[PDB]
Write a protein that binds this DNA or RNA. Structure first.
Lengths: 618, 590, 89
RNA sequence: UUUGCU
RNA sequence: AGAGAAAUCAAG
């Protein structure tokens, strides 16, 4: 009959303090008055040696007169106060209102202590009181509100502690006419239909007995289409020095002649490179426009194509439809995967270690060190460094409109200090107005091997530096600023394989209840058939290479394919555990996957890998 | 892909984080969005009738239909009025304490809401300048227009803003004095069209989809009602176990994963997403659900009108078509608005209003998320469905615990049918039921037995924010710590991310190699003492939350003289972020 | 707001990236490097904070303690806590 | 716009 | 030319 947070003596006194049945609220009035008196009792319970305060309400006027005479105060009969601190000789009334902030002064005779319904108080009142009593009041009011909501008395309590509300919104007549123009119901919808949930004859759920196969597309093999090269990236070793010195050394000793010419990148464009290199050797990365630049960066090509199109304006307008050219898994993806995990004589992931203060810190640093040692000396790490440096140097030159050719060399440095010239990136005359605009680039890179079917649009020249021979591939690209910024920190690709490695190591540690940061067990995989698994280190290296390729070839096709392959990955996991997979009517997840297999060579590689795995589990 | 399918040590669920390419550049949407917008607008009408009859469906005001017209084999666009009423009543009766909390919000929190919070939204299409502007300037312009046309001082409370809107709408005509004094006129119909016009835009950087999809934003005249309804929806959703709102997802998913019978029953885990989720809902169902809730709550009448107004305006909406459909004449290319030339969307030509198209059915993504989630959740309430359910807007996971497989399949089909009943279609190809339960996916969190991997949708940008060295270091360490304690990165990956961010942060402030800053510090013998100066990092995995200066002082890496020089407030270089002020807290010019 | 994030590297490498108030305690040139720009707040280069850390005007240790008290509380709380044997399971 | 992240 | 993908940049 009473809340669990209400005592007996206070309850009985509140029930007998007034005639509550003659008022509008017969129950909540008693409850709120008892709450106020319980707050008074709790605040007065504490002491300094004398009690902090003392209860005044709900007592005869004799004690009121005695206190007034002694404690230097006067208390009228209309609105008797409830609390009075003698240490400060100040009278406070602990009233609770829904308005946390709005506390209009009912009277100016004495200070008023208004409290929030949820426990809070005024802006400049709780400071005078200590902390523990504030927490007690907060908890009591929270429990009070909990009981109120439990017994569906929110509106009644709000009325009790706030008088009555008012209609704070009203809608006119013409506005109602506007609102009721496109719906069969009025502003307050009252469909004269009995509520009822009917029964509909559905379709049965079919079981997925065997995993689906993904469609493999046919057509020309997909050529390499990344911004820069992958495993076929090399560098020229130059004496230690600044970028200008290295470029001058390269320019002085260089005999460049075309080996293979591509129609997309005419050999004449080589003049744009050397002329740039020379300029960069003199200390001016920005260079004046020359004739070849027109072909190199498509200067005025917009108007040229506009005229070449208007020349064929004799026709009829048709709804412009687009066709994406389907292509098959090119054979160079497997070769790229093999070459990306080849060893290197140097470690290409040199990140400063964090500080160690705790055992957890030591374990984390050990795991990171082991991971870096595992994947640090691979071709993929060097390619990642090359990509990051090239992207950073190219993106740093796209913050201002420029009508001149810029030089952005790709030069790293070995620990001994020798410069490593991976290539060059010439930035054409750009006017960056939108962050997604495509800046024109002429990218020259040092290759290890040339394949016409893999680099159809690259022009390959020979480059002789002090006897040594190199291949220099030139490509006329147009790349978005956003993608350049994204690749500026391509180093994040190291996180996912690190996640896998750390999870495996920690699982082994938990199983053995003793961390061993040098364990590389055999991971069983669905490989060709010659072998039945790999070591943990080799698997981590392969994962890093594949993830790098996925990041480099990330486009809408890749995003859709990966998003829709998680369902099938989960289905395969369920089947591996002899669970059952059931599907709704007319369900075909393989269709969702197949919608995203068009051009992306890496997506085709992943689809082929999926197809090679068993599609039935017994 | 077989490389991503372990058969030992770990499982394919563990390697689910490998099926992500967020480390690569997210795709962007190019050129005109008219095709996507028109497809979104036409999808609802093609699904209203089992036999696609768009023309017959263009006259339906309230998308209500009988259960005989609901397509159980393909997407359905309408809703059942009686089913909506009964399901809303059941939802009210089940989560009654949530209704009480909502009533407390309505009777206490709602009146005090301040319209200034309206200035924290997407860019708004001002109905005067006819060009998109940031939210605060648009709010100021709208308020000034209201005050000028009403001759009153609109109160700070949000209800005053809404009442001011409802009052200006009664005016036969309105005028705005520009400020540069230029007058602008408005007829009641013109202002009504401006208020009910949603401006569309490409959803950029959206990963995980092959096709680009658009989103819509409302006017500033109706954003107050939208905010009221969305706040009410949030308040109700925070107090129900079936919601996927940003609540303690770890606790929720773990609790549902642990659920099991006495090992004799049949358990199933259905993971799925809704197809055409926004392109099938009807605002009439949403407002009817809200009206049922309010009426059962004993709320006053003006409250119900206030809650219904935004959905009424959305029903009579006007979607901006963008720039036009692309056409080619030989080798040219020209954008033309719908209507001039034949196209697949010719059925909608009758709905064209200027450059905006009128549509009563369907909805646009990014406008009513919480209301859509509430509509989805009310469907789950009925005697047949006795399993658990979690819904995050378009994603959902259901846990069936039945006596036999037949009951489980019946409950699954009943769930699908009820969702169709309220206007929500589960994508059949994206819905997978595993039996026995234990493996599932939801909201990019993958559950296996008793392990939930919270796979991050995006990697943290492990680069300095660009404010200043100290602030950037603090923010980056905080981001890494947050991503760690949410399960998105374990200790090794957290330390690796710390190292990567450290390298990027040192590079951005010219401290890694031979630069002007390092050359200056070497010539004048300024020993590097801070992280941005090139000193070795002082933070660790365990100390990702501490401040660099205090940590260095405690460890003895900073001396009282250096601290006094650094922390001198009289230096001319002075400007949750808890980085103490210092000479290294400068502000960049541009 | 990714705009400042993608502009930091370029912003820091500008000729006069930092904006500081005029002050004679910052010399026009130090050891042959121009620090402040007397353009028509004034502009300074990225080496000004380092030059200040090495030659700035020291303040009273009381101000330093007042500034650093809040963070030193957390640092001391962390370093005072004792962490038990790390387990695996 | 002067050029050095393994 | 080229970048790219269901339509845009390759200036104005």
């Amino acid at each position: 009959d009473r809340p669990d947070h209400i005592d007996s003596r206070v309850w009985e006194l509140s029930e007998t303090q007034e005639d509550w049945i003659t008022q509008v609220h017969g129950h909540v009035r008693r409850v709120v008055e008892c709450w106020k008196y319980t707050i008074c009792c709790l605040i007065s319970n504490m002491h300094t040696g004398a009690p902090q305060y003392d209860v005044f309400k709900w007592q005869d006027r004799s004690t009121i007169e005695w206190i007034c005479s002694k404690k230097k105060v006067q208390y009228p009969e209309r609105d008797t106060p409830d609390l009075y601190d003698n240490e400060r000789a100040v009278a406070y009334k602990v009233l609770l209102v829904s308005d946390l902030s709005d506390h209009s002064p009912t009277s100016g005779i004495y200070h008023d202590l208004a409290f929030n319904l949820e426990g809070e108080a005024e802006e400049s009142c709780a400071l005078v009181l200590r902390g523990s009593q504030l927490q007690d009041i907060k908890g009591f009011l929270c429990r009070a509100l909990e009981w109120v909501v439990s017994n569906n008395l929110t509106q009644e309590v709000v009325e009790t502690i706030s008088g009555e509300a008012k209609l704070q919104f009203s809608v006119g007549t013409t506005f109602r006419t506007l609102l009721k123009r496109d719906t069969d119901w009025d502003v307050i919808p009252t469909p004269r239909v009995e509520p009822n949930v009917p029964r509909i004859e559905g379709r049965r759920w079919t079981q997925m007995k065997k995993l689906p196969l993904l469609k493999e597309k046919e057509g020309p093999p997909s050529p390499w289409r990344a911004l820069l090269l992958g495993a076929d990236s090399e560098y020229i070793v130059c004496p230690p020095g600044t970028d200008q010195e290295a470029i001058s050394w390269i320019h002085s000793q260089s005999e460049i002649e075309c080996i293979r010419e591509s129609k997309s990148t005419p050999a004449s464009v080589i003049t744009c490179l050397t002329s740039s290199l020379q300029s960069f050797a003199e200390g001016n990365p920005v260079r004046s426009r020359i004739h070849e630049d027109i072909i190199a960066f498509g200067i005025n090509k917009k108007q040229e194509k506009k005229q070449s199109a208007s020349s064929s304006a004799s026709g009829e307008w048709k709804r412009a439809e687009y066709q994406v050219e389907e292509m098959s898994l090119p054979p160079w993806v497997e070769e790229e995967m093999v070459l990306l995990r080849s060893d290197q004589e140097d470690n290409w992931i040199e990140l400063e270690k964090n500080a160690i203060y705790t055992e957890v810190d030591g374990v984390a640093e050990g795991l990171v060190d082991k991971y870096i040692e595992i994947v640090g000396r691979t071709k993929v790490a060097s390619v990642i460094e090359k990509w990051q440096i090239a992207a950073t140097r190219t993106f740093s030159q796209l913050h201002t409109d420029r009508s001149r050719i810029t030089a952005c060399p790709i030069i790293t440095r070995d620990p001994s200090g020798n410069c490593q010239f991976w290539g060059m990136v010439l930035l054409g005359p750009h006017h960056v107005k939108r962050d997604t605009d495509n800046a024109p680039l002429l990218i020259a890179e040092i290759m290890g091997e040339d394949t016409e079917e893999k680099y159809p649009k690259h022009s390959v020249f020979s480059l002789k530096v002090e006897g040594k021979q190199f291949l220099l591939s030139l490509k006329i690209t147009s790349f978005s600023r956003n993608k350049l910024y994204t690749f500026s920190n391509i180093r994040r690709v190291l996180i996912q394989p690190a996640s896998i490695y750390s999870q495996v190591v920690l699982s082994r540690a938990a199983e053995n209840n003793s961390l061993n940061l040098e364990v590389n067990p055999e991971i069983q995989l669905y490989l060709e058939g010659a072998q039945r698994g790999m070591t943990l280190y080799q698997w981590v290296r392969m994962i890093l290479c594949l993830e790098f390729l996925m990041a480099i070839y990330n486009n809408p096709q890749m995003e859709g394919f990966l998003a829709n392959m998680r369902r099938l990955h989960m289905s395969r996991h369920a089947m591996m555990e002899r669970r059952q997979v059931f599907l709704p009517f007319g369900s075909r997840p393989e269709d969702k996957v197949n919608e995203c297999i068009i051009n992306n060579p890496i997506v085709a590689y992943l689809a082929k890998g999926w197809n090679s795995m068993p599609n039935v589990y017994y | 892909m077989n490389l991503f399918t372990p058969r030992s040590e770990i499982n394919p669920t563990t390697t689910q984080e490998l099926l992500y390419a967020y480390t690569g550049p997210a795709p962007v949407a190019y050129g005109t969005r008219t095709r996507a917008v028109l497809e979104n607008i036409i999808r609802p009408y093609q699904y209203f009738y089992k036999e696609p009859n768009v023309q017959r469906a263009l006259d339906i005001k309230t998308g209500c239909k009988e259960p005989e017209d609901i397509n159980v084999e393909g997407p359905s666009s309408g809703f059942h009025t009686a089913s909506v009423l009964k399901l809303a009543d059941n939802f009210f009766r089940k989560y009654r304490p949530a209704m009480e909390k909502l009533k407390y919000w309505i009777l206490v929190k709602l009146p005090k809401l301040k319209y200034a919070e309206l200035s924290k939204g997407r860019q708004t299409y001002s109905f005067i300048h006819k060009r998109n502007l940031p939210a605060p300037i648009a709010l100021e312009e709208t308020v000034e227009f209201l005050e000028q046309n009403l001759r009153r001082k609109i109160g700070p409370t949000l209800l005053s803003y809404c009442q001011a809107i409802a009052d200006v709408m009664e005016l036969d005509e309105t005028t705005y004095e520009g400020a540069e004094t230029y007058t602008i006129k408005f007829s009641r119909e013109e202002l009504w069209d401006q208020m009910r016009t949603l401006n569309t835009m490409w959803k950029h950087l959206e990963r995980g989809r092959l096709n680009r999809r658009t989103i819509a934003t409302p006017s500033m005249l109706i954003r107050g009602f939208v905010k009221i309804v969305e706040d009410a929806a949030k308040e109700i959703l925070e107090n129900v176990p079936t919601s996927g709102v940003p609540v303690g997802g770890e606790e929720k998913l773990a609790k549902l994963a642990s659920k099991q019978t006495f090992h004799t029953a049949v358990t199933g885990e259905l993971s799925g997403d809704q197809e055409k989720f926004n392109e099938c809902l009807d605002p009439d169902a949403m407002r009817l659900m809200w009206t049922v809730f309010l009426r059962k709550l004993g709320c006053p009448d003006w409250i119900m009108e206030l809650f219904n107004i935004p959905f009424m305006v959305f029903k009579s909406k006007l979607a901006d078509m963008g720039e036009g459909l692309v056409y080619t004449k030989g080798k040219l290319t020209d954008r033309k608005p719908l209507g001039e030339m034949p196209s697949e969307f010719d059925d909608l030509v009758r709905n064209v209003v200027g450059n905006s198209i009128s549509c009563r059915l369907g909805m646009f993504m990014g406008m009513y998320n919480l209301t859509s989630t509430l509509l989805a959740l009310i469907s789950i309430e009925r005697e047949e469905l006795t399993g658990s359910h979690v819904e995050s807007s378009d994603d959902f996971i259901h846990f069936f615990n039945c006596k036999t497989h037949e009951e489980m399949f019946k409950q699954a089909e009943t769930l699908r049918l009820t969702l169709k009943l309220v206007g929500i279609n589960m994508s059949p190809s994206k819905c997978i039921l595993i039996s026995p339960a234990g493996i599932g996916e939801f909201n990019s969190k993958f559950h296996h037995r008793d392990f939930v991997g919270n796979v991050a949708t995006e990697l943290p940008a492990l680069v300095p924010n660009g404010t200043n060295p100290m602030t950037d270091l603090a923010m980056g360490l905080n981001v890494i710590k947050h991503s760690v304690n949410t399960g998105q990165m374990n200790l090794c990956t957290g330390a690796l991310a710390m190292r990567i961010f450290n390298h990027a942060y040192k590079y951005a402030y010219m401290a890694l190699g031979v630069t002007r800053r390092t050359r200056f510090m070497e010539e004048n013998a300024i020993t590097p003492l801070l992280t941005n100066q090139g000193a070795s990092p002082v933070h660790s995995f365990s100390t990702m939350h501490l401040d660099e200066v205090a940590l260095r002082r405690h460890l003895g890496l900073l001396d009282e003289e250096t601290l006094r020089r650094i922390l001198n407030p009289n230096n001319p270089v002075t400007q949750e972020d808890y980085s103490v002020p210092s000479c290294f807290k400068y502000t960049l010019s541009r | 707001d990714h705009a400042p994030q993608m502009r930091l590297v370029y912003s820091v490498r500008k000729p006069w990236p930092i904006s500081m108030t005029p002050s004679k305690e910052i010399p026009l040139v130090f050891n042959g490097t121009k620090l402040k720009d007397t353009i028509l707040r004034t502009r300074a280069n990225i080496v000004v904070p380092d030059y200040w850390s090495k030659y700035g005007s020291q303040t009273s240790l009381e101000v330093v303690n007042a500034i650093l008290y809040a963070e030193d509380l957390k640092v001391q709380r962390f370093f005072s806590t004792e962490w038990g044997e790390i387990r695996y399971g």
